[PDB]
Amino acid sequence: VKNSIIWFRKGLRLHDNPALLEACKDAKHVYPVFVLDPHFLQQKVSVNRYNFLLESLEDLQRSFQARGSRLLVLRGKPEEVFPRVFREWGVTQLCFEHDTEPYAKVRDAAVRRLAAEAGVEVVTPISHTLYDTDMLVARNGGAAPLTMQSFTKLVDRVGDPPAPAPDPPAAMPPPAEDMPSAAPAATGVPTWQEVGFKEPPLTVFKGGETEALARLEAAFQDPKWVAGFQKPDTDPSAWEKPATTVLSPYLKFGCLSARLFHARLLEVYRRHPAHSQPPVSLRGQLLWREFFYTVGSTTPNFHRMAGNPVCKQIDWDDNPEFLAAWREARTGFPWIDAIMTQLVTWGWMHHLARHSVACFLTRGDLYVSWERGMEVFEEHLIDQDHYLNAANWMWLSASAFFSQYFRVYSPVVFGKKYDPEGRFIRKFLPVLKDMPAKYIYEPWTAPLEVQRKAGCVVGRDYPAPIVDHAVASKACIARMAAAYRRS
Ligand SMILES: Cc1cc2nc3c(=O)[nH]c(=O)nc-3n(C[C@H](O)[C@H](O)[C@H](O)COP(=O)(O)OP(=O)(O)OC[C@H]3O[C@@H](n4cnc5c(N)ncnc54)[C@H](O)[C@@H]3O)c2cc1C
Numbered sequence: 278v279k280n281s282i283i284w285f286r287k288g289l290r291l292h293d294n295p296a297l298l299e300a301c302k303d304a305k306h307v308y309p310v311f312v313l314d315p316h317f318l319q320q321k322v323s324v325n326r327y328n329f330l331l332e333s334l335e336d337l338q339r340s341f342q343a344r345g346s347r348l349l350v351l352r353g354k355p356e357e358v359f360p361r362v363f364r365e366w367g368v369t370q371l372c373f374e375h376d377t378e379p380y381a382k383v384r385d386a387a388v389r390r391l392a393a394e395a396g397v398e399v400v401t402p403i404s405h406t407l408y409d410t411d412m413l414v415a416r417n418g419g420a421a422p423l424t425m426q427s428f429t430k431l432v433d434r435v436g437d438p439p440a441p442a443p444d445p446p447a448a449m450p451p452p453a454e455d456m457p458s459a460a461p462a463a464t465g466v467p468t469w470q471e472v473g474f475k476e477p478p479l480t481v482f483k484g485g486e487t488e489a490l491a492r493l494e495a496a497f498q499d500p501k502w503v504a505g506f507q508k509p510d511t512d513p514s515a516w517e518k519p520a521t522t523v524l525s526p527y528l529k530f531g532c533l534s535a536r537l538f539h540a541r542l543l544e545v546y547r548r549h550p551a552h553s554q555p556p557v558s559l560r561g562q563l564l565w566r567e568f569f570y571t572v573g574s575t576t577p578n579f580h581r582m583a584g585n586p587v588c589k590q591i592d593w594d595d596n597p598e599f600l601a602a603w604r605e606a607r608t609g610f611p612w613i614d615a616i617m618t619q620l621v622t623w624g625w626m627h628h629l630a631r632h633s634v635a636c637f638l639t640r641g642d643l644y645v646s647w648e649r650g651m652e653v654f655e656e657h658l659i660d661q662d663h664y665l666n667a668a669n670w671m672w673l674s675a676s677a678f679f680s681q682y683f684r685v686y687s688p689v690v691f692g693k694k695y696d697p698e699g700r701f702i703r704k705f706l707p708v709l710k711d712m713p714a715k716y717i718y719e720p721w722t723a724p725l726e727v728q729r730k731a732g733c734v735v736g737r738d739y740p741a742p743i744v745d746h747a748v749a750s751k752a753c754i755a756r757m758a759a760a761y762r763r764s
């Protein structure tokens with residue numbers, strides 16, 4: 278008989294799961310498995326993203342139980358767990374979604390070799406990205422495109438991505454009974470308290486495939502908004518109703534299929550001929566994700582500067598004080614500090630909000646390496662993606678892809694074009710809730726009587742600006758320009 282394992286790493290969903298479909302075909306028993314390293318905090322990871330993962334696992338548990346099955350959360354490392362459950366469950370097939378991250382290639386190669394020794398077949402379909410990213414490179418002549426212009430024309434020559442896979446059957450082959458490594462107590466989904474975290478999560482975004490589909494439907498409730506979507510025109514200060522879809526944490530963990538998202542977009546585009554085109558459209562946003570995945574998976578040392586063939590070598594400053602003030606949201610610029618407070622509270626900010634704080638830390642004001650603020654984003658972002666976090670930080674620092682270092686965002690003026698009243702600032706920085714709007718972006722310019730009346734005295738309740746933007750940006754521009762000369 279056939280006994281299979283469907284190994285979850287990414288792709289925490291039931292819809293568009295060709296690996297799950299194969300595992301259930303002609304199967305007597307199916308073992309849904311997620312492998313959790315219980316010593317991961319003994320390394321970096323915030324409770325916001327880790328609880329998002331746990332909430333996504335609890336959603337899988339209810340979905341499997343509704344189909345007569347169960348999700349098994351095995352504790353330990355995959356290389357040590359799988360050789361045991363292969364013989365214990367009489368496994369003949371192992372299925373999991375393909376992953377192109379560096380650690381994923383080392384891990385999956387080791388489990389493949391262990392599966393061959395136990396006579397287990399390995400089926401690894403592609404469904405985390407829109408396309409077979411290795412196919413895109415081969416179609417382009419053996420090298421990945423380096424511009425969105427040429428990449429968009431590559432996929433247009435390939436055609437539509439594959440259609441989403443059909444839903445799994447209403448009843449699934451359950452795990453075998455009385456298997457010791459499948460005991461319920463050892464295979465349950467833990468809470469954030471049990472994994473070691475002390476402080477509770479504060480994000481307003483809940484994980485799971487169910488919430489992902491619900492937020493997807495809410496996005497397509499207004500087809501004119503989907504059709505005319507222009508990414509650079511959205512509002513970074515919108516927080517009650519965010520200006521974009523906020524589907525990034527669900528695409529990161531695979532709670533939502535990128536191919537289902539892409540198929541729903543094509544349904545809308547066929548009915549609206551004046552719809553927006555790449556790269557500014559919603560489809561173009563999925564293409565930015567596919568573009569950086571294609572470039573990153575074929576570039577060595579992509580998440581670093583040294584040894585990176587696509588990254589420009591700049592002599593960034595080793596300034597721990599600027600990094601600490603930026604990390605702890607005490608730079609003195611309320612627009613910057615409010616965004617960084619949103620980073621650690623929600624784990625998500627708008628794209629242009631990430632532009633403001635990344636430009637401020639790097640090529641704009643503080644001249645700190647993009648790798649340092651990178652590690653800050655990697656800790657708190659609930660949508661942190663190894664290839665997207667890296668490529669966009671190389672973009673904002675003018676180290677890769679982007680080159681117009683004369684475009685420097687202002688930490689004072691940028692947010693005021695969207696939110697002159699500072700409603701976004703008063704939300705995440707309640708110390709300035711009573712500050713008049715004339716000074717909410719420049720509290721240090723308010724007279725001392727205004728500061729006392731509002732209960733926010735600069736230097737006592739809110740810090741002074743760490744730098745003068747006119748002075749700091751003038752020096753940073755002249756240092757980026759000289760670097761590009763030797764480049
Ligand atoms: C410094 C910096 C770091 C970033 N780090 C991440 C990260 O770790 N994870 C991440 O998902 N995005 C990252 N981004 C990209 C972008 O800011 C987010 O994808 C976006 O804010 C998510 O909001 P949304 O889901 O509403 O996007 P929408 O505008 O609704 O776009 C839909 C989807 O397209 C993709 N997408 C959108 N913009 C980009 C982009 N610029 N690059 C790649 N894919 C994109 C995402 O999967 C997103 O969910 C980063 C950007 C910057 C400037």
Ligand SMILES: [Cl-]
Binds near residue numbers: 686
């Ligand atoms: Cl500006």
